[PDB]
Design a protein around this ligand. Structure first.
Ligand SMILES: [Mg+2]
Lengths: 69, 138, 207, 15, 69
DNA sequence: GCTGCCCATTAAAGA
DNA sequence: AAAATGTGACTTTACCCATAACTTTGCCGTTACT
DNA sequence: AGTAACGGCAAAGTTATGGGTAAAGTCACACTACGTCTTTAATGGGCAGC
């Protein structure tokens, strides 16, 4: 079981052995030493980011198709 | 044959119908029945019809849930034909092409042809339905 | 049970706690990885049509933008010539050269020539430990992509030879190969310079 | 063809 | 019969295995099933099987299931 | 000058 | 004599929208019985 | 003539099946498989006898 902070990429929480346990990503150390107000804005920015990149697979596929043709 | 068309859960549901009907067919209805009147009346009527026609009433209580379901294809036929052709002539080849590149080529051909393009899930599902000797040999 | 090479998959991940120097650099032309591989494609002779084998591909790629900085193809094994070449093209179509160049523990890199050239052009030479591949991981996976997007979609590819026990004279790529070194290099450069170059990256959200 | 023994009817039984 | 030798299979391996089979038990098997290897499609093995009234069976090429035992 | 007789070698495919 | 590099391209679930082919119901008409 | 039980009409619900997108999950990049022994038959030289 997992929980996540919409206001923080760097943090997650997983249920291991009977303990809500902190989980560290990468946008944690990379986002260490900043406030809690810009952290949440950068967090929302990276959510849409990682989404919107999943949707652009069509253009990559089209370019690959032209090259392979 | 009607019995043999049914499934184990069809057997269970028809048995539930039978245990609902049987007290009504014994003159001792229960004083606490969750099933309403119309449903038990329908089940009893079907029991009577089956026992009066086929010589065994339980066959009337069968549901045959396999007969229901939308077994109709949703993609247009031109897309189906073009995807079959692409699978035959661009995926079953001595090149071991990945599904993504052949799907991209299929999408480009569909866009030139003006036909509705399929999704990657559609291509994967129709490729895993053509698996066997033919795919492994080509 | 198996050894230190096989246990390397489950070894460990070094998870950053604080802000050390970034793994993949801070700007273009800061950390560039150099690595070679044996391309899985058979090539016939341009004139006489006899099979020549599998060419070797040498990649120099920056770690920041993942852009394939220089690509080289030669039939020979790993030897300086390789290195002079990738670096010539680097300093040719682009302009300069890296700042920190990681390079495994080859011989082409423990030689005197490559080290002297790096000293002359002031490039910090970094060396990954033996049998460890994650230290040039960003480079090495760029090989696999080249397999899926360009190489495995060609005739005579050396893909079905991974299962050596299932190979027949009707499926041997040495009888199906038709490509040549020049055309294969041309199309590999096309893929690395205008196909993969304009494709959006998951780790950058931009081409 | 190659290494292929010619068609023959070999005697059977220990001489 | 079990035989072990460093050399690649040839008519010598068949010779030794058949001699061992005769020594341990006393009789060769009535129908000997062999693979399409060149060491079986030779002149020594065929006359050896003919001498002792042994029906020789040949599994089709690239079909190992015929020797599934 | 003509003809018969044992030795090397080429041929590929299957384990 | 020695710290401190995993990626990301290509698949596979997983959930939602649409519709077929029936069961599951209420509700009213009809009828046997009081 | 009033009331309870039975059955038709119909819509409501239930699985089922072929589609769509979005995101969790796999796995190959890590130098690398093609290589070697065995088999009979035909042929082509030299070498020798007539
Ligand atoms: Mg490779």
């Amino acid at each position: 079981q997992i929980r996540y902070d919409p206001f923080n990429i760097g943090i997650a929480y997983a249920f291991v052995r009977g303990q809500w346990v902190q989980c560290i990503s990468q946008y944690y150390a990379e986002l260490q030493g900043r406030s809690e107000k810009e952290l949440k804005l950068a967090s929302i920015e990276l959510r849409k980011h990682y989404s919107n990149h999943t949707q652009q697979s069509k253009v990559s596929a089209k370019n690959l198709a032209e090259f392979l043709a | 044959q009607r019995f043999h068309q049914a499934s184990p859960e069809d057997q269970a549901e028809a048995l539930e119908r039978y245990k609902t009907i049987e007290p009504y067919l014994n003159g001792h209805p229960p004083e606490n029945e969750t099933i309403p009147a119309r449903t038990i009346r329908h089940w009893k009527a079907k029991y009577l019809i089956a026992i009066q026609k086929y010589g065994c009433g339980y066959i009337g209580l069968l549901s045959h849930r396999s007969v229901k379901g939308n077994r109709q294809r949703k993609l247009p036929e031109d897309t189906l034909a073009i995807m079959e052709k692409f699978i035959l002539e661009d995926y079953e080849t001595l090149k071991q092409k990945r599904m993504w590149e052949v799907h991209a080529a299929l999408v480009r051909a569909c866009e030139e042809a003006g036909v509705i393009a399929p999704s990657y899930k559609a291509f994967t599902k129709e490729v895993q339905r053509r698996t066997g000797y033919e795919q492994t040999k080509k | 049970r198996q050894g230190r090479r096989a246990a390397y998959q489950h070894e460990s991940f070094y998870w950053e706690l604080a802000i050390t120097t970034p793994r993949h650099g801070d700007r273009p032309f800061e950390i560039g990885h150099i690595a070679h591989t044996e391309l899985d494609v058979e090539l016939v002779c341009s004139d006489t049509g006899r099979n020549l084998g599998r060419p070797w591909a040498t990649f120099l790629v920056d770690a920041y933008s993942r852009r394939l900085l220089a690509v080289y193809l030669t039939f020979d094994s790993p030897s300086y010539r390789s290195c002079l070449m990738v670096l010539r093209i680097c300093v040719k179509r682009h302009g300069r050269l890296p700042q920190i160049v990681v390079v495994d523990n080859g011989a082409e890199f423990h030689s005197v020539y490559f080290e002297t050239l790096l000293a002359t052009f002031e490039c910090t030479k970094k060396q990954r430990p033996p049998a460890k591949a994650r230290f040039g991981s960003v480079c090495e996976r760029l090989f696999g992509t080249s397999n899926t997007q360009f190489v495995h979609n060609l005739l005579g590819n050396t893909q079905i030879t991974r299962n050596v026990r299932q190979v027949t004279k009707s499926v041997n790529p040495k009888n199906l190969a038709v490509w040549t070194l020049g055309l294969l290099y041309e199309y590999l450069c096309a893929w690395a310079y205008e196909v993969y170059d304009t494709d959006e990256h998951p780790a950058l959200f931009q081409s | 063809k190659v290494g292929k023994r010619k068609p023959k009817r070999d005697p059977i039984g220990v001489q």
